[PDB]
Structure formats: C-alpha cells, structure tokens
Amino acid sequence: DLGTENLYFQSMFTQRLDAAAAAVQAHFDKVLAAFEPLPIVEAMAHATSGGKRLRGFLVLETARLHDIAAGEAIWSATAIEALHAYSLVHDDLPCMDNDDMRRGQPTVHKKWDDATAVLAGDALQTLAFELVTHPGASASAEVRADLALSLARASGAQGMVLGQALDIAAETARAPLSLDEITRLQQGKTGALIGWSAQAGARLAQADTAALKRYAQALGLAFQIADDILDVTGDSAQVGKAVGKDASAGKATFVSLLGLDAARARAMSLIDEACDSLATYGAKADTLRETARFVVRRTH
Template identity: 65%
Template sequence: MFEAAIASAAGRIEAELERIMAPLPDQPVIEGMRYACRGGKRLRGFLVMEGARLHGIGPEQSVVAACAAEALHAYSLVHDDLPCMDDDDLRRGQPTVHVKWDEATAVLVGDALQTLAFDLLARPECAPQAEVRVALIASFARAVGAEGMVLGQAQDIAAETAGRMLTLEEITELQVNKTGALICWSGAAGALLAQADPQPLTDYAAALGAAFQIADDILDVEGDAAEVGKAVGKDAEAGKATFVSLLGLEGAKARARLLVEQAEAALEPYGAEALALKEAARFVIARNK
C-alpha cells in the first residue's frame, strides 16, 4: 500500500512542480531549480498528502503544501552540498548543483526554492481559508528556520570545530532540528489543512524523523554509493559523532526499530486508514538509499 501511495504522491508532486515552474523565465537559476527538484523519495510530500487524506483533504489541494515541503527540502540539499558546508559532488546519483553550474548559481537556486515554498503556502489553492494559510506558514517558518532546520545545520557545523565528540543527547537534539523539524511539519500539515488536532501526526512524524536519521547514519556505514546516490563513509572519515558511532551498529538499528514502533503507536486514532503511514515508518529503516 505504501509503495503505491508514495508513487502516486510523487507523480502528482512532480507534475505540479513542473506546472508551477513552467512560466518562469529560461535562466540558469530556473534550470537549476528544476534540476534540484527532480528525483528523490518524496517522503516529505507524501507525508503531507497522506496526512491530509486522513482528514478528508483531497490530493488536488494537498499537493500544493506537499510541493512546498519538497521545494524547501531541495533548497536545503543544494545549500548543504556547497563547498562551505558538506562539500558534496553527488546528490541523487547526479552532480550537485554547484558542480553542474557554479557556487553562485547554487546559492541562488537554494534561495529561490526556499522563497517558492513560502509562496506556495500563501496561495489560495493551498487552503481557501486565510487563517489556515497563516498557520501553515508560521509553523513552516519555525520548522525550517533558526528554531529548526537552520539551527540544526548550525549545530552540525559547530560540532566540526568543537574539539570533542558530541554526546548522544547533543546529536539527538542536532538531528531533531536538522532533519526532524521539516519531517515533523510535513507530518502535521494535513491536519493543519483540515483545522484538526495535529498532535497524533506530529508524534508519528517525530519518531519517523528520528528513525530516518538513524537509517541515514547506518547507510553511511553499510550503504553502497551507487545505490545511495551520494558519497558514503564521510562521517567516519571526518570523525563525526553519529548514532552508529555512539550506539554501535546494532544499537543504532535497535533504536531505529523502537522508534518505528513508537511511530506506529501514534497512529492508533486513525485505525486501518493509517496503514500506508505505518508502512512508511517501516520503509525508512529498510531503505537502501
């Protein structure tokens, strides 16, 4: 069920992003935006759309907020790959934006994708009620800014010069911000669209986001670069603290499995209707990329 649901969501998101960017002028920065948005798992967009479906919001509406999540995620990857950040040459099996074009273009591509995300959430087709759009935008800003994703990026950079390994508590906080905040927002967005209680989906997405990051750390140790679509083994080479380095490989896997159980438990209010989301939680720790 999950595979069919995420494939359907991904198809809608791809088509909608193409439609949204079609009127934009033919410039390198626009070409870079389209390039950066291609491919990927579309997990965040799927979470938006599936959470919306649980609350009676159809895909023709929820796809707009899903595209906002994916555009924001694409921006974060473009900037994360820059030489001044993680300095990666490969993303989703393709040259990173700064490699294919140049660093200045990559910075502008990221900037444009970030602002596009907020533009989409402000559009009436995202939600007809202005108060719903304001709630989405405000929560989105907190999730991806200095209280969330950007804070996590800053904590990650600071850790490189800290002169010591981060503790488990510190690495958990870092990843809750860097990776988990946008996943949490994506999980809760469907309930926000419907003006329903977002807490069950927030709890689900928080556990899923934590499991997702642990799975990333495991893939950095066990993954194949050709399958993962980016370089592996970089964390160990850099001496970075990860869930694997702090818990051991088997300990990290056990923690990820526990988080999946917590994610599934949070979905109990939705009963059988939440099967695809439960399968998504299992997917994040079984994936090979």
C-alpha cells in the first residue's frame, strides 16, 4: 500500500501516469523481445521493469503539450527510462553504493553477479541511444540527432556522470558540503536527466525549450529534496530500497544541512516555482502542474 489514494491526485494526472507506465513497459517488452535470451538481456529487462516512470512520463506529457504523437514520443520516453535504469544498475554496484534491493527486488549484481550488472548497465546506455535515434522517434532527422546530442551531454562527464564523480569524491572524504555545493552536485546527478525529459516535448516539436527547462530546474531540485527526505523518514517497503543510508555514508544532503522542516518548506516553494514556470502554457500544462505536487508528496 503506497498511500496514494490518500493524496487525492487529480484524476487526469493519475490516469495519464498509469497509462504512461504501462506504455513504457510495453515498449521495453517489444524492443527487448528482439534480443537473445541470455542472462545479460534478462538483467536488462529486470533493471527496466517497474519504477514510477517520472522521466518517461515527462517526455510523454511534454510531447502531448506540444501536440506530438504518443506513438513517436514513446521512443524518447523509453530511451530516458533506459538511461536512468543503466545509471541505477551501476550506482547499486558494490564498488559504488553497494545496494541489495531496488524497486522491491534484488539488484542485478545480487540476482546475477557484478559482471552481468556492469554489462547490462552498459547495454542499457547503448539502448537509450538506439531508441532516440530510431526512425520512429521523429520524422525529422534533425530532431533525432539533436535528441541524441542533448542526451549525451545530459548523461556524460558534464552531466550525470560528473555528478556521480563529485558525489563519490564527497563520500570518500566524508566531506562537509555547503548548500551551494550539494545543489551543483544535484544539478548533474539528478537534474540533468529530469531536464532532458521535460525539454523533450519541446525538442520533438522544434519549439522553444526555455519554459520547460526552468520548470525542470525546480522540479528536479524538489524531486531530489524529496528523495533525501524519503531516506530519512521513508518506509523501505514503500520505497523499495534501503533507507537511512545517507547518514551512514557521511553524505551531506538537503535534509542533513537544512533539517526536515526547512527541506520540506523548500520543496513546497519549488512546487510553486515549477508551476509558475508553466504560466505561458496556460491550462494545457495542468498535468505538469500536478506532476510537481506529486514529486514532493509521493511516498515512493
């Protein structure tokens, strides 16, 4: 029981999030069906099953906002979910965060072994780029090439991998970071893929990305604050991964620096910032407004 009903999320948001999760899973199923039945591929399927699909949902809903067909947008939605999944397979490794459970199930290296986890994460990164450049993703090659270039910049040693590297350099020193420092780290480690996801609908429509980029800056920070709160107050049965971890690793997080009350308040302010950033879209962006409430109020 995730306690979702108790939160009274808007009907359209709930229906659309449920449909997006089923659509992403169906697309992974179809794409992976073409691959050989070997442990690495089974591990790819394991690692991509489940999840909230926030990032894939952002792609689908920003595409909807820009009148892009769902049948095209699914490619980019699945792509970002593949990229995200790869990052978690590697993060969970013994040499990194060393976690035994993810999404309520054993992690890849636990169910198989470390080599299988390394390779499944490697192939999932590759699959993200296959999915965004597949001709089904857009009738425009310029759009596909730009989606892939942007994804590489979000994902690599200026984006997500940079954030990871900085995080590890902190874990190892058990170092005390300022609020600015953990914010710069967050921007790479988690902000970059959420930014790519929210900008995707505009990129697919060859439209201005500025409003969705601003939206995503707020949303991503709210999301990370919420994640840091769940580590402190959350229930491992609901969250599907171990909690209480950050303290033991000597991690400065938004909660360790600000305290819970002020972290919650900051996340609440960021809902407003995120919603304000959508003003130019008017009512058509209402699902994306409710997404900002979800990212803070979710139990998992």
